[PDB]
Symmetry: D2
Subunit: 196 residues, 4 copies
Amino acid sequence: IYEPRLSRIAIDKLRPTQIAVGFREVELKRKEWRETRDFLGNHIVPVVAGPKDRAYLIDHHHLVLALSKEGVEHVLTSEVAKFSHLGKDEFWSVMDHRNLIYPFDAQGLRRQSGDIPKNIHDLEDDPFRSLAGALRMAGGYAKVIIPFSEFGWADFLRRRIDRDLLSDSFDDALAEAMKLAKSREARHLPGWCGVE
Amino acid sequence: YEPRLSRIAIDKLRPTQIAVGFREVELKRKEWRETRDFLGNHIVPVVAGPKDRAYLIDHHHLVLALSKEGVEHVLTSEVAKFSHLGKDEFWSVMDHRNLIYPFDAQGLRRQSGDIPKNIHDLEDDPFRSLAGALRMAGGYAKVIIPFSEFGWADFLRRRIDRDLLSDSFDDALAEAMKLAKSREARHLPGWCGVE
Amino acid sequence: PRLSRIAIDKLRPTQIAVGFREVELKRKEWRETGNHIVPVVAGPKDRAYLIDHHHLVLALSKEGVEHVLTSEVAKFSHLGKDEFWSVMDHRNLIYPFDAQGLRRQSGDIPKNIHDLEDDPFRSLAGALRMAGGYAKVIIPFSEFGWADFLRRRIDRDLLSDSFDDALAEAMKLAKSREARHLPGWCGVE
Amino acid sequence: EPRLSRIAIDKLRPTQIAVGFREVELKRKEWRETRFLGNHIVPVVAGPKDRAYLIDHHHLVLALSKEGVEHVLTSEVAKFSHLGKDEFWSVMDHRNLIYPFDAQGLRRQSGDIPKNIHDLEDDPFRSLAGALRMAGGYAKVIIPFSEFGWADFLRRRIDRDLLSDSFDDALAEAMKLAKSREARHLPGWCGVE
């Protein structure tokens, strides 16, 4: 019986696997959606079965918060791994070990597993996460297969662009980021894309 | 942020490989037959190709099983879009990315042109069946390398008489096993013996 | 990539613990018997960071080897300390866990090779692989994944007192559906 | 746990058919003033017989060869010496350590891989692709033979004449291309989304 299957869960029941997202990206998703008119072809979101019966969301937090904020109750899911034989301790370890969690808060601090929110509606806003998204969307770096590429870019920017620039003027913060992305200083980042 | 759910008729799915192991197909059939919306149904990865064509990217054993059991459609998920490309380039892109596997039932390389266009035209590669069976018996580990099993099928086809495989499969499996465990097979993915 | 050289006592580790039994075994090879090359990452200062082979490099150190060839596989020396560890972590090139599998912070990663803490479950998982327990694999820190699984299921005391006994137990857990979720699992499906 | 050795570069067996000569000419001029305690180590597979197969860096070794460097350090990173020859190529292909495409992008049998660096064919588009990445039109990436996939995309869209008779027009047309929607599917793509 050869693999993943469609299922269906209440968004209020998904367990997050990261502490933060960029609310700006969330809000853009919510516009797109607010402005589009069976089950074919809604979003499917990948998930892992954890302890008790719980499903842990593995990607697409922005989209899931967007949908949740739009009043959408359910989302299609596909279980891509089954760890429900583990206790909770072991589970988080295995997840951590397999790079399926990202316990970093809105100001980029490593935090413990227990600090990972239990409901989606508790994600924190990481404004550098939004900046790093927009940067990519602008052509500042490439998508790469590395997990949490964006969060790497967000940490780079956060040490280099003033938060006050970012709330004052997003596009000027973006313009800065764009000057930095291209500099030799960002050379060590995944997806880096400039003159050698 | 992106993936959506879709459907095709299986007769419209375009394969990306030439052979499968028919024993493994029959086991998947036997199962399906024996399990109890659209919730519960199988979903398979697919790349958008030239004209409007969906190309199945993994799970050929399952797709053929399902097709041989009469099942008319399957749930899919576009995971890449190359409809902007023309035929030649698409095919080349496909290989550059190892989304294709054009080796025939006797393990020989062929040209994109030789890839079947229905699931129903897949050849039987019996050493691919032996490799699956060897994995399930715990002769080596699953591993994320694409085509791990076919790499094993090749090892075995250089070493185990084809005939033995029809005469006694369990004998072919025991042979496979004693090779899986030895240093001869150490270069293979998922290798699992004494160091 | 091109080739260089440091004193071993100058190499910066990137993990807290290694399996001391495995280290002792590696000695006995090198001892009972084409120099060794080892990948390193250039960080803050000219400074060299060892990205693998801690067991082997420590074994060399304990045998009195002064130096070791090395191959620099990445510069990060334009970064401060902090950004550096952050990057290392994101790149998964650090394993900041101690002898009991406990997450410690990047600053608690030791500065010298002989400051490596001993984890016996790393040693047991080591041995389990060599015995056909599970498959070498591309996943990073794979043996530590196995050491965590064992450490929750085999008495530390049994491990310290009788290694064969622990390994027989580990063998039996390795082939069982409880281990199915681990990298390299090799059991009857 | 790898170890070092050297080989005569004649004795090293290649693993692809083509390199970009413009890229080899470059590595030669750069190399030219610098100035074994810090030489180059290059990754190699131990093959059937005692033969050693170059795993990357053909552009570089060709450059050495052509400045009369005789040996090179090497790190044996895989051992396939227990295999027959036929098996050996097949495992090579399976692990994507060979690139049997000639200077035209055309797929050739593994028999047609040259047995000496000095027979590497010139793929002008490979050189374009190298200069393109260097201009920052796309990005390095963990994927196997990326530059080549970009050679193959440019080879389809910019006639050969512009390459031989004017490198930079060529570089420039390449750049407008690497930023467009048209290249979205390439690894490293970096244009506006």
